Amino acid sequence: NFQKVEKIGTYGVVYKARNKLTGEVVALKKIRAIREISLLKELNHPNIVKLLDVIHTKLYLVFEFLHQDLKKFMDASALTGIPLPLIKSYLFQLLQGLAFCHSHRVLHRDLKPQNLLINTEGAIKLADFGLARVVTLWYRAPEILLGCKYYSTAVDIWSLGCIFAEMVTRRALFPGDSEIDQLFRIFRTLGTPDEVVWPGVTSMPDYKPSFPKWARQDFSKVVPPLDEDGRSLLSQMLHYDPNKRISAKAALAHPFFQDVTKPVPHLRL
Ligand SMILES: O=C(O)c1cc(C(F)(F)F)ccc1Nc1ccc2[nH]c3ccccc3c2c1
Numbered sequence: 001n002f003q004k005v006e007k008i009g010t011y012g013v014v015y016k017a018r019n020k021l022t023g024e025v026v027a028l029k030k031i032r033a034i035r036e037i038s039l040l041k042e043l044n045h046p047n048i049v050k051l052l053d054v055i056h057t058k059l060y061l062v063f064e065f066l067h068q069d070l071k072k073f074m075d076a077s078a079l080t081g082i083p084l085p086l087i088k089s090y091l092f093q094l095l096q097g098l099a100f101c102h103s104h105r106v107l108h109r110d111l112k113p114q115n116l117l118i119n120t121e122g123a124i125k126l127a128d129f130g131l132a133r134v135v136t137l138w139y140r141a142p143e144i145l146l147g148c149k150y151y152s153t154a155v156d157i158w159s160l161g162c163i164f165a166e167m168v169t170r171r172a173l174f175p176g177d178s179e180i181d182q183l184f185r186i187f188r189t190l191g192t193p194d195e196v197v198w199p200g201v202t203s204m205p206d207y208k209p210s211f212p213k214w215a216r217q218d219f220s221k222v223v224p225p226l227d228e229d230g231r232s233l234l235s236q237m238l239h240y241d242p243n244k245r246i247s248a249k250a251a252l253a254h255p256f257f258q259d260v261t262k263p264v265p266h267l268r269l
Pocket of ligand 1: 011029031037040041043044048049050051061100101104106127128129130131132133
């Protein structure tokens with residue numbers, strides 16, 4: 001091939017590779033439309049991983065390479081926790097990237113810590129989009145689990161709220177291991193949704209009137225250490241009704257980010 005390899009990890013396998021005739025180190029994703037994927041090469045943002053080349057012959061996607069992901073960093077930080085100023089910077093940057101692609105009517109659809117790449121300079125970038133269309137369901141929005149066949153940009157805000165909570169508490173918010181276990185983990189924390197808080201929920205394809213009715217707990221129980229600014233913002237990212245869920249652009253204006261900075265992480269590569 002044109003590259004030397006090293007595997008680093010739903011669409012296919014991903015390799016760290018070196019371009020044999022530029023020296024460039026890249027992320028090589030082998031899959032197993034073309035006109036629209038290629039439009040993504042032209043769209044770039046500091047908080048989105050760059051798509052360098054599309055190659056069809058099997059579908060190959062060449063991305064810029066980043067050394068660490070947020071899942072590895074959270075595990076590495078599990079005894080101490082990520083410092084709040086760094087959580088806030090990462091959240092702010094992720095909302096910046098979401099606001100950009102949502103402004104282009106592009107959804108991620110499968111945000112998770114594993115898909116969030118970080119570098120030594122303090123940046124974090126969206127990667128591994130779910131665009132081609134054991135699976136982790138922990139960050140799935142409730143409208144997806146209830147079988148809605150039209151995602152909106154709100155599904156990415158939901159996932160990012162789940163990731164926000166996980167950075168703060170150092171435990172996954174909703175670690176379900178089946179669709180209904182995921183759904184009921186959400187229900188037990190936020191209350192079983194009804195027509196009052198989510199108009200139209202009872203007519204969604206996978207809704208059952210027989211769902212158990214759990215009462216809502218309180219956000220002070222959910223992300224304890226977090227101050228009222230952060231708890232407020234998280235509550236707005238976890239609204240059941242996708243129409244009530246805060247947008248990325250509005251989240252950026254939230255008081256939580258009034259003192260945001262850009263700290264440098266301690267990374268062990
Ligand atoms: O992440 C992946 O695996 C991935 C897979 C495909 C596949 F459909 F070919 F599979 C396509 C794109 C993919 N990511 C990607 C890369 C750069 C980007 N730039 C953007 C600007 C605005 C909105 C979105 C993006 C964007 C998204």
